[PDB]
PDB file of C-alpha atoms and ligand atoms in Angstrom:
ATOM      1  CA  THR X  35      -5.968  -2.248 -24.534  1.00 43.65           C
ATOM      2  CA  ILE X  36      -6.286  -3.228 -20.928  1.00 42.89           C
ATOM      3  CA  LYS X  37      -5.950  -0.008 -18.864  1.00 43.42           C
ATOM      4  CA  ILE X  38      -4.180  -0.832 -15.516  1.00 43.18           C
ATOM      5  CA  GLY X  39      -4.434   1.847 -12.881  1.00 42.62           C
ATOM      6  CA  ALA X  40      -1.434   2.724 -10.432  1.00 40.57           C
ATOM      7  CA  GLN X  41      -1.595   4.924  -7.412  1.00 40.49           C
ATOM      8  CA  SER X  42       1.122   7.536  -6.944  1.00 43.27           C
ATOM      9  CA  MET X  43       3.461   5.012  -5.214  1.00 40.03           C
ATOM     10  CA  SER X  44       6.471   3.097  -6.461  1.00 38.27           C
ATOM     11  CA  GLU X  45       4.843  -0.234  -5.318  1.00 39.25           C
ATOM     12  CA  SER X  46       1.671   0.442  -7.286  1.00 40.48           C
ATOM     13  CA  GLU X  47       3.748   1.299 -10.600  1.00 41.15           C
ATOM     14  CA  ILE X  48       5.825  -1.997 -10.139  1.00 42.58           C
ATOM     15  CA  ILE X  49       2.821  -4.034  -9.633  1.00 41.92           C
ATOM     16  CA  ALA X  50       0.811  -2.438 -12.386  1.00 40.35           C
ATOM     17  CA  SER X  51       3.773  -3.056 -14.902  1.00 39.35           C
ATOM     18  CA  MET X  52       4.244  -6.574 -13.643  1.00 40.86           C
ATOM     19  CA  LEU X  53       0.572  -7.389 -14.256  1.00 37.83           C
ATOM     20  CA  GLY X  54       0.724  -5.751 -17.696  1.00 36.65           C
ATOM     21  CA  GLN X  55       3.782  -7.721 -18.744  1.00 32.69           C
ATOM     22  CA  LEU X  56       2.352 -10.878 -17.627  1.00 29.89           C
ATOM     23  CA  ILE X  57      -0.780 -10.230 -19.526  1.00 27.69           C
ATOM     24  CA  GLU X  58       1.215  -9.579 -22.620  1.00 28.59           C
ATOM     25  CA  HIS X  59       3.373 -12.729 -22.035  1.00 33.61           C
ATOM     26  CA  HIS X  60       0.250 -14.841 -22.215  1.00 27.05           C
ATOM     27  CA  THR X  61      -2.124 -13.155 -24.618  1.00 32.43           C
ATOM     28  CA  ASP X  62      -2.301 -10.903 -27.643  1.00 30.85           C
ATOM     29  CA  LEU X  63      -3.809  -8.143 -25.353  1.00 29.92           C
ATOM     30  CA  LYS X  64      -2.129  -4.618 -25.369  1.00 29.98           C
ATOM     31  CA  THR X  65      -1.820  -3.137 -21.870  1.00 30.50           C
ATOM     32  CA  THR X  66      -1.073   0.229 -20.572  1.00 29.74           C
ATOM     33  CA  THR X  67      -0.591   1.891 -17.171  1.00 29.86           C
ATOM     34  CA  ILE X  68      -2.695   4.824 -15.939  1.00 28.17           C
ATOM     35  CA  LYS X  69      -0.447   6.304 -13.546  1.00 27.38           C
ATOM     36  CA  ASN X  70      -0.639   8.911 -10.626  1.00 25.12           C
ATOM     37  CA  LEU X  71      -4.178   8.000  -9.358  1.00 24.78           C
ATOM     38  CA  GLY X  72      -4.212   9.968  -6.164  1.00 25.56           C
ATOM     39  CA  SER X  73      -5.999   7.642  -3.732  1.00 24.84           C
ATOM     40  CA  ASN X  74      -8.284   4.630  -2.979  1.00 23.25           C
ATOM     41  CA  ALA X  75     -11.322   6.864  -3.993  1.00 25.17           C
ATOM     42  CA  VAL X  76      -9.752   7.822  -7.250  1.00 22.81           C
ATOM     43  CA  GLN X  77      -9.091   4.167  -8.211  1.00 20.14           C
ATOM     44  CA  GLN X  78     -12.680   3.292  -7.057  1.00 21.28           C
ATOM     45  CA  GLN X  79     -14.277   5.900  -9.246  1.00 23.82           C
ATOM     46  CA  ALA X  80     -12.020   4.944 -12.337  1.00 22.14           C
ATOM     47  CA  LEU X  81     -12.992   1.426 -11.900  1.00 19.56           C
ATOM     48  CA  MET X  82     -16.701   2.253 -11.953  1.00 22.13           C
ATOM     49  CA  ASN X  83     -16.567   4.643 -14.832  1.00 23.59           C
ATOM     50  CA  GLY X  84     -14.365   2.584 -17.132  1.00 21.50           C
ATOM     51  CA  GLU X  85     -11.349   4.806 -17.011  1.00 22.63           C
ATOM     52  CA  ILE X  86      -9.324   1.766 -15.707  1.00 21.79           C
ATOM     53  CA  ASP X  87      -9.922  -1.957 -16.314  1.00 21.74           C
ATOM     54  CA  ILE X  88      -7.810  -3.176 -13.531  1.00 25.35           C
ATOM     55  CA  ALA X  89      -6.720  -1.458 -10.187  1.00 26.34           C
ATOM     56  CA  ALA X  90      -3.275  -2.921  -9.616  1.00 25.10           C
ATOM     57  CA  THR X  91      -2.973  -2.232  -5.866  1.00 25.97           C
ATOM     58  CA  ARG X  92      -5.808  -1.743  -3.471  1.00 25.39           C
ATOM     59  CA  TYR X  93      -5.572  -2.309   0.265  1.00 25.84           C
ATOM     60  CA  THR X  94      -8.219  -3.971   2.378  1.00 22.94           C
ATOM     61  CA  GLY X  95      -8.304  -1.644   5.346  1.00 24.56           C
ATOM     62  CA  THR X  96      -8.366   1.426   3.059  1.00 28.04           C
ATOM     63  CA  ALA X  97     -11.327   0.062   1.096  1.00 29.65           C
ATOM     64  CA  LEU X  98     -13.287  -1.263   3.993  1.00 31.45           C
ATOM     65  CA  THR X  99     -13.312   2.210   5.727  1.00 32.85           C
ATOM     66  CA  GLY X 100     -13.072   4.532   2.882  1.00 33.73           C
ATOM     67  CA  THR X 101     -15.168   2.912   0.064  1.00 35.01           C
ATOM     68  CA  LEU X 102     -17.513   0.613   2.099  1.00 38.19           C
ATOM     69  CA  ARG X 103     -17.795   2.737   5.125  1.00 42.09           C
ATOM     70  CA  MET X 104     -17.699  -0.401   7.304  1.00 42.64           C
ATOM     71  CA  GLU X 105     -16.622  -0.807  10.876  1.00 44.96           C
ATOM     72  CA  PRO X 106     -12.998  -1.623  10.966  1.00 44.43           C
ATOM     73  CA  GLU X 107     -11.950  -5.285  11.337  1.00 43.28           C
ATOM     74  CA  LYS X 108      -8.849  -6.301  13.100  1.00 41.56           C
ATOM     75  CA  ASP X 109      -8.372  -9.770  11.652  1.00 39.09           C
ATOM     76  CA  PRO X 110      -6.716  -9.725   8.242  1.00 33.21           C
ATOM     77  CA  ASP X 111      -8.567 -12.768   6.909  1.00 32.29           C
ATOM     78  CA  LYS X 112     -12.032 -11.464   8.034  1.00 34.61           C
ATOM     79  CA  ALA X 113     -11.344  -8.134   6.640  1.00 33.13           C
ATOM     80  CA  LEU X 114     -10.304  -9.582   3.131  1.00 35.51           C
ATOM     81  CA  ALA X 115     -13.429 -11.888   3.174  1.00 38.46           C
ATOM     82  CA  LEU X 116     -15.813  -8.971   4.059  1.00 41.01           C
ATOM     83  CA  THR X 117     -14.237  -6.715   1.384  1.00 40.04           C
ATOM     84  CA  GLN X 118     -14.429  -9.516  -1.241  1.00 38.47           C
ATOM     85  CA  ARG X 119     -18.037 -10.189  -0.356  1.00 40.24           C
ATOM     86  CA  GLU X 120     -19.156  -6.394  -0.399  1.00 39.78           C
ATOM     87  CA  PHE X 121     -17.154  -5.495  -3.515  1.00 39.48           C
ATOM     88  CA  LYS X 122     -18.879  -8.202  -5.591  1.00 35.89           C
ATOM     89  CA  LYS X 123     -22.365  -7.325  -4.105  1.00 34.43           C
ATOM     90  CA  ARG X 124     -22.247  -3.552  -4.263  1.00 36.66           C
ATOM     91  CA  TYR X 125     -20.146  -2.817  -7.242  1.00 34.38           C
ATOM     92  CA  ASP X 126     -19.799  -6.182  -9.276  1.00 36.44           C
ATOM     93  CA  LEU X 127     -16.007  -5.765  -8.566  1.00 36.59           C
ATOM     94  CA  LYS X 128     -13.779  -8.860  -8.010  1.00 37.56           C
ATOM     95  CA  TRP X 129     -11.286  -8.092  -5.196  1.00 40.26           C
ATOM     96  CA  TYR X 130      -8.796 -10.833  -5.701  1.00 40.34           C
ATOM     97  CA  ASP X 131      -6.946 -12.655  -3.002  1.00 42.08           C
ATOM     98  CA  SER X 132      -3.690 -10.835  -1.889  1.00 40.69           C
ATOM     99  CA  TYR X 133      -0.490 -10.741  -3.767  1.00 42.86           C
ATOM    100  CA  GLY X 134       1.020 -11.787  -0.489  1.00 41.48           C
ATOM    101  CA  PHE X 135       1.979  -8.602   1.244  1.00 42.28           C
ATOM    102  CA  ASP X 136       0.484  -5.891   3.422  1.00 39.61           C
ATOM    103  CA  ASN X 137       1.392  -2.236   3.244  1.00 43.32           C
ATOM    104  CA  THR X 138       0.525  -0.559   6.388  1.00 44.37           C
ATOM    105  CA  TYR X 139       1.007   2.943   7.864  1.00 46.81           C
ATOM    106  CA  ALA X 140       3.880   2.665  10.443  1.00 46.03           C
ATOM    107  CA  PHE X 141       5.121   5.280  12.723  1.00 46.25           C
ATOM    108  CA  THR X 142       8.869   5.114  12.176  1.00 48.28           C
ATOM    109  CA  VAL X 143      12.009   6.582  13.921  1.00 48.71           C
ATOM    110  CA  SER X 144      15.759   6.135  13.534  1.00 45.44           C
ATOM    111  CA  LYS X 145      17.132   3.141  15.182  1.00 45.84           C
ATOM    112  CA  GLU X 146      19.340   5.711  17.092  1.00 44.42           C
ATOM    113  CA  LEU X 147      16.422   7.446  18.562  1.00 46.22           C
ATOM    114  CA  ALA X 148      14.685   4.190  19.347  1.00 43.08           C
ATOM    115  CA  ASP X 149      17.859   2.892  21.089  1.00 42.81           C
ATOM    116  CA  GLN X 150      18.278   6.049  23.025  1.00 43.82           C
ATOM    117  CA  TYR X 151      14.771   6.394  24.444  1.00 45.73           C
ATOM    118  CA  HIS X 152      13.908   2.707  24.358  1.00 48.53           C
ATOM    119  CA  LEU X 153      11.072   3.228  21.746  1.00 45.95           C
ATOM    120  CA  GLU X 154       9.320   0.137  20.801  1.00 47.90           C
ATOM    121  CA  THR X 155       5.557   1.120  20.574  1.00 50.41           C
ATOM    122  CA  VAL X 156       3.523   4.108  19.532  1.00 47.65           C
ATOM    123  CA  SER X 157       2.554   4.589  23.019  1.00 51.06           C
ATOM    124  CA  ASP X 158       6.192   4.850  23.980  1.00 52.90           C
ATOM    125  CA  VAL X 159       6.312   8.261  22.260  1.00 55.60           C
ATOM    126  CA  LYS X 160       3.198   9.630  23.906  1.00 55.07           C
ATOM    127  CA  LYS X 161       5.208  11.411  26.576  1.00 55.50           C
ATOM    128  CA  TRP X 162       7.559  12.780  23.988  1.00 54.93           C
ATOM    129  CA  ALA X 163       5.014  13.839  21.307  1.00 53.07           C
ATOM    130  CA  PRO X 164       5.182  17.523  22.086  1.00 54.35           C
ATOM    131  CA  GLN X 165       8.933  17.560  21.387  1.00 52.49           C
ATOM    132  CA  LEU X 166       8.747  15.494  18.166  1.00 53.46           C
ATOM    133  CA  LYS X 167       8.397  16.636  14.632  1.00 54.61           C
ATOM    134  CA  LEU X 168       6.212  14.233  12.661  1.00 50.85           C
ATOM    135  CA  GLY X 169       6.509  13.913   8.902  1.00 53.43           C
ATOM    136  CA  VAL X 170       3.434  12.433   7.052  1.00 53.05           C
ATOM    137  CA  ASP X 171       2.194  11.936   3.430  1.00 54.62           C
ATOM    138  CA  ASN X 172       0.182  14.551   1.584  1.00 56.60           C
ATOM    139  CA  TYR X 173      -3.186  12.678   2.502  1.00 57.25           C
ATOM    140  CA  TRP X 174      -3.142  11.523   5.968  1.00 56.65           C
ATOM    141  CA  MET X 175      -3.988  14.810   7.772  1.00 52.88           C
ATOM    142  CA  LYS X 176      -7.360  15.143   5.897  1.00 54.65           C
ATOM    143  CA  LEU X 177      -7.908  11.345   5.848  1.00 57.28           C
ATOM    144  CA  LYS X 178     -10.980  10.030   7.513  1.00 61.72           C
ATOM    145  CA  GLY X 179     -11.176   6.924   9.726  1.00 57.92           C
ATOM    146  CA  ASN X 180      -7.568   6.157  10.157  1.00 56.64           C
ATOM    147  CA  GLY X 181      -6.174   9.606   9.525  1.00 57.71           C
ATOM    148  CA  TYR X 182      -4.646  12.228  11.761  1.00 52.44           C
ATOM    149  CA  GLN X 183      -7.907  13.283  13.386  1.00 52.47           C
ATOM    150  CA  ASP X 184      -8.855   9.799  14.625  1.00 48.98           C
ATOM    151  CA  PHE X 185      -5.237   9.064  15.534  1.00 51.21           C
ATOM    152  CA  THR X 186      -5.046  11.959  17.943  1.00 52.91           C
ATOM    153  CA  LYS X 187      -8.429  10.900  19.365  1.00 52.67           C
ATOM    154  CA  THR X 188      -7.300   7.178  19.784  1.00 54.93           C
ATOM    155  CA  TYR X 189      -3.765   7.745  21.069  1.00 56.00           C
ATOM    156  CA  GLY X 190      -4.334  10.929  22.896  1.00 56.78           C
ATOM    157  CA  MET X 191      -1.167  12.573  21.845  1.00 59.32           C
ATOM    158  CA  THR X 192      -0.490  15.491  19.476  1.00 63.56           C
ATOM    159  CA  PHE X 193       2.896  16.126  17.914  1.00 61.03           C
ATOM    160  CA  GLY X 194       4.848  19.236  18.399  1.00 60.74           C
ATOM    161  CA  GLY X 195       5.035  19.715  14.672  1.00 60.19           C
ATOM    162  CA  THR X 196       3.398  17.932  11.803  1.00 61.47           C
ATOM    163  CA  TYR X 197       4.771  18.187   8.203  1.00 60.58           C
ATOM    164  CA  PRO X 198       2.825  16.820   5.296  1.00 61.58           C
ATOM    165  CA  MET X 199       5.044  15.917   2.248  1.00 61.62           C
ATOM    166  CA  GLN X 200       5.027  13.479  -0.634  1.00 59.58           C
ATOM    167  CA  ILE X 201       5.363   9.977   0.915  1.00 61.02           C
ATOM    168  CA  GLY X 202       8.525   9.215  -0.968  1.00 58.09           C
ATOM    169  CA  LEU X 203      10.298  12.061   1.122  1.00 56.71           C
ATOM    170  CA  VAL X 204       9.618  10.881   4.574  1.00 57.55           C
ATOM    171  CA  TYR X 205      12.413   8.315   4.557  1.00 54.23           C
ATOM    172  CA  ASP X 206      15.283  10.791   4.086  1.00 52.46           C
ATOM    173  CA  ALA X 207      13.335  13.242   6.321  1.00 54.76           C
ATOM    174  CA  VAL X 208      13.715  10.966   9.303  1.00 51.15           C
ATOM    175  CA  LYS X 209      17.257   9.724   8.247  1.00 51.54           C
ATOM    176  CA  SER X 210      18.625  13.138   8.106  1.00 52.53           C
ATOM    177  CA  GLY X 211      17.038  14.365  11.388  1.00 49.37           C
ATOM    178  CA  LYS X 212      14.693  16.956   9.734  1.00 48.58           C
ATOM    179  CA  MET X 213      11.912  14.877  11.298  1.00 48.29           C
ATOM    180  CA  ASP X 214      12.064  12.931  14.489  1.00 50.16           C
ATOM    181  CA  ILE X 215       9.317  10.501  13.475  1.00 44.60           C
ATOM    182  CA  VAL X 216       7.411   9.819  10.216  1.00 45.25           C
ATOM    183  CA  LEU X 217       4.374   7.863   9.197  1.00 43.09           C
ATOM    184  CA  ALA X 218       5.992   5.548   6.836  1.00 44.19           C
ATOM    185  CA  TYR X 219       4.622   2.765   4.605  1.00 42.83           C
ATOM    186  CA  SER X 220       5.735  -0.634   5.789  1.00 42.87           C
ATOM    187  CA  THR X 221       6.694  -1.960   2.368  1.00 41.86           C
ATOM    188  CA  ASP X 222       9.079   0.844   1.626  1.00 42.77           C
ATOM    189  CA  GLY X 223      12.477  -0.557   0.704  1.00 46.52           C
ATOM    190  CA  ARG X 224      14.496   2.277   2.427  1.00 42.81           C
ATOM    191  CA  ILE X 225      13.414   1.310   5.904  1.00 46.82           C
ATOM    192  CA  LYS X 226      15.960  -1.418   6.254  1.00 46.01           C
ATOM    193  CA  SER X 227      19.085   0.181   4.721  1.00 44.57           C
ATOM    194  CA  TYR X 228      18.318   3.451   6.272  1.00 44.96           C
ATOM    195  CA  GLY X 229      18.396   1.784   9.659  1.00 43.88           C
ATOM    196  CA  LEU X 230      14.925   2.852  10.646  1.00 42.10           C
ATOM    197  CA  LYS X 231      12.617   1.304  13.124  1.00 40.65           C
ATOM    198  CA  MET X 232       8.900   0.699  12.853  1.00 41.14           C
ATOM    199  CA  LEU X 233       6.973   1.131  16.160  1.00 43.84           C
ATOM    200  CA  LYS X 234       4.419  -1.292  17.101  1.00 47.18           C
ATOM    201  CA  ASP X 235       0.784  -0.005  16.809  1.00 46.22           C
ATOM    202  CA  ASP X 236      -0.072  -1.119  20.483  1.00 48.14           C
ATOM    203  CA  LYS X 237      -3.576   0.151  20.286  1.00 47.92           C
ATOM    204  CA  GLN X 238      -4.312  -1.613  16.936  1.00 48.64           C
ATOM    205  CA  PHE X 239      -5.380   1.727  15.473  1.00 48.74           C
ATOM    206  CA  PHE X 240      -4.426   0.748  11.852  1.00 49.99           C
ATOM    207  CA  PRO X 241      -6.482  -2.003  10.257  1.00 49.77           C
ATOM    208  CA  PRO X 242      -5.025  -4.775   7.979  1.00 51.59           C
ATOM    209  CA  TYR X 243      -3.794  -3.421   4.686  1.00 53.84           C
ATOM    210  CA  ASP X 244      -3.397  -6.492   2.544  1.00 55.76           C
ATOM    211  CA  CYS X 245      -2.821  -5.761  -1.162  1.00 56.25           C
ATOM    212  CA  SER X 246      -4.895  -7.084  -4.014  1.00 58.33           C
ATOM    213  CA  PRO X 247      -5.833  -6.360  -7.593  1.00 56.29           C
ATOM    214  CA  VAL X 248      -9.458  -5.392  -8.233  1.00 52.94           C
ATOM    215  CA  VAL X 249     -11.291  -5.952 -11.574  1.00 54.31           C
ATOM    216  CA  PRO X 250     -14.711  -5.410 -12.766  1.00 57.92           C
ATOM    217  CA  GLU X 251     -16.653  -8.620 -13.375  1.00 57.49           C
ATOM    218  CA  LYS X 252     -17.566  -7.123 -16.820  1.00 54.45           C
ATOM    219  CA  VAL X 253     -13.997  -6.953 -17.745  1.00 53.56           C
ATOM    220  CA  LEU X 254     -13.383 -10.575 -16.681  1.00 52.46           C
ATOM    221  CA  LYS X 255     -16.346 -11.765 -18.772  1.00 49.58           C
ATOM    222  CA  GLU X 256     -15.108  -9.899 -21.823  1.00 48.69           C
ATOM    223  CA  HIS X 257     -11.605 -11.069 -21.433  1.00 48.29           C
ATOM    224  CA  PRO X 258     -11.872 -14.747 -20.007  1.00 42.64           C
ATOM    225  CA  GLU X 259      -8.155 -15.183 -20.122  1.00 40.16           C
ATOM    226  CA  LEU X 260      -7.478 -12.444 -17.541  1.00 42.24           C
ATOM    227  CA  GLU X 261      -8.606 -14.546 -14.431  1.00 40.71           C
ATOM    228  CA  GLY X 262      -5.951 -17.187 -14.948  1.00 38.48           C
ATOM    229  CA  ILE X 263      -3.318 -14.679 -15.569  1.00 37.09           C
ATOM    230  CA  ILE X 264      -4.059 -12.511 -12.459  1.00 36.34           C
ATOM    231  CA  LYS X 265      -4.078 -15.736 -10.394  1.00 36.75           C
ATOM    232  CA  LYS X 266      -0.419 -16.344 -11.312  1.00 37.07           C
ATOM    233  CA  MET X 267       0.593 -13.439  -9.138  1.00 35.67           C
ATOM    234  CA  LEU X 268      -1.555 -14.168  -6.032  1.00 34.99           C
ATOM    235  CA  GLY X 269       0.043 -15.369  -2.880  1.00 29.12           C
ATOM    236  CA  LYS X 270       3.655 -15.109  -4.392  1.00 31.67           C
ATOM    237  CA  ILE X 271       4.872 -11.710  -3.452  1.00 30.39           C
ATOM    238  CA  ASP X 272       5.854 -11.400   0.278  1.00 31.17           C
ATOM    239  CA  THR X 273       6.428  -8.283   2.210  1.00 29.82           C
ATOM    240  CA  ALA X 274      10.162  -8.838   2.113  1.00 28.92           C
ATOM    241  CA  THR X 275      10.207  -9.204  -1.623  1.00 32.24           C
ATOM    242  CA  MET X 276       7.903  -6.147  -2.053  1.00 32.78           C
ATOM    243  CA  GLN X 277      10.369  -4.118   0.036  1.00 37.63           C
ATOM    244  CA  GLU X 278      13.197  -5.228  -2.153  1.00 36.47           C
ATOM    245  CA  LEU X 279      11.254  -4.313  -5.426  1.00 35.23           C
ATOM    246  CA  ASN X 280      10.393  -0.868  -3.990  1.00 39.95           C
ATOM    247  CA  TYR X 281      14.194  -0.422  -3.154  1.00 38.91           C
ATOM    248  CA  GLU X 282      15.077  -1.202  -6.727  1.00 39.95           C
ATOM    249  CA  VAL X 283      12.960   1.795  -7.798  1.00 43.55           C
ATOM    250  CA  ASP X 284      13.641   4.256  -5.002  1.00 42.40           C
ATOM    251  CA  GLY X 285      17.132   3.305  -3.883  1.00 43.17           C
ATOM    252  CA  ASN X 286      18.637   1.800  -7.001  1.00 44.63           C
ATOM    253  CA  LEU X 287      17.018   4.274  -9.398  1.00 47.07           C
ATOM    254  CA  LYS X 288      15.475   1.721 -11.644  1.00 46.67           C
ATOM    255  CA  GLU X 289      12.239   2.297 -13.578  1.00 46.74           C
ATOM    256  CA  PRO X 290       9.345   0.409 -12.322  1.00 46.56           C
ATOM    257  CA  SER X 291       8.828  -1.401 -15.590  1.00 48.98           C
ATOM    258  CA  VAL X 292      12.473  -2.655 -15.422  1.00 49.19           C
ATOM    259  CA  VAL X 293      12.146  -3.727 -11.947  1.00 44.71           C
ATOM    260  CA  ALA X 294       8.965  -5.620 -12.858  1.00 42.91           C
ATOM    261  CA  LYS X 295      10.727  -7.176 -15.895  1.00 44.74           C
ATOM    262  CA  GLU X 296      13.750  -8.381 -14.009  1.00 41.28           C
ATOM    263  CA  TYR X 297      11.553  -9.845 -11.348  1.00 40.56           C
ATOM    264  CA  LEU X 298       9.395 -11.733 -13.873  1.00 40.27           C
ATOM    265  CA  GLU X 299      12.593 -13.147 -15.487  1.00 39.64           C
ATOM    266  CA  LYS X 300      14.129 -14.153 -12.246  1.00 38.45           C
ATOM    267  CA  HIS X 301      10.873 -16.045 -11.320  1.00 38.83           C
ATOM    268  CA  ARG X 302      10.312 -17.301 -14.816  1.00 39.98           C
ATOM    269  CA  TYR X 303       6.885 -15.471 -14.887  1.00 38.74           C
ATOM    270  CA  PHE X 304       5.674 -17.629 -11.987  1.00 41.91           C
ATOM    271  CA  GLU X 305       5.796 -20.904 -13.721  1.00 43.56           C
TER     272      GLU X 305
HETATM  273  C1  CHT N   1      -0.868   1.587   1.371  1.00 41.85           C
HETATM  274  N1  CHT N   1      -1.459   2.542   2.411  1.00 41.85           N
HETATM  275  C2  CHT N   1      -2.470   1.843   3.025  1.00 41.85           C
HETATM  276  C3  CHT N   1      -0.401   2.723   3.411  1.00 41.85           C
HETATM  277  C4  CHT N   1      -1.929   3.860   1.860  1.00 41.85           C
HETATM  278  C5  CHT N   1      -2.899   3.729   0.717  1.00 41.85           C
HETATM  279  O1  CHT N   1      -3.093   4.994   0.261  1.00 41.85           O
END
């Protein structure tokens, strides 16, 4: 049984299920999803100690800072190449090419607020920060490198209130007016239909967050059919599509496994 890890995000559950279903489509391997992994670090340790055989969704900027403790790299291609090289060298892990989407932190407001105050960039809210309530996920306040501490230092603003909550809640928090601004994830499917506006990170504080599966080389050697199966997903899932899939779960109330199955059927399992 191939154990596929998912972080506590709809996106990760969808992709983990899709990869599992694709493996079962092509082979006699059983698969199962190890859900609710809390973070990049949890995924990393689980890969290294055999608790998961595949990490469905890891993100380059997160791993480059968090796991590798390297200086950030602004260019997506260079960041991916560095991550791939160092993951193989340091951990004998294969960090695959991206599925085709990046999922970045994005400061997000209602279009109404953006229109009223001409907000386009993160710097545009600097003068307003003391009068804004910011909603954020339950990790970002303690997060190192690109978390709240470095953000305040780089952008030189502090919000009037900061409210950590489970990430899935921030979208209706800002839509309903409870928060004025939230640190959303750019692939969330609610951003569009909730009429939200992502502000440009004009200081380039956030690194690239291209998403890939990661697998130990030992697992690939023992299951030589996995490489060609994983490859079928790479470069095929763009950000707009990921947003649509996430929406099916969070807005259309479908199970991630059903969303994955329906996508595979629509796209004929990528062949
Ligand atoms: C996907 N993000 C980079 C937004 C968070 C990962 O924990």
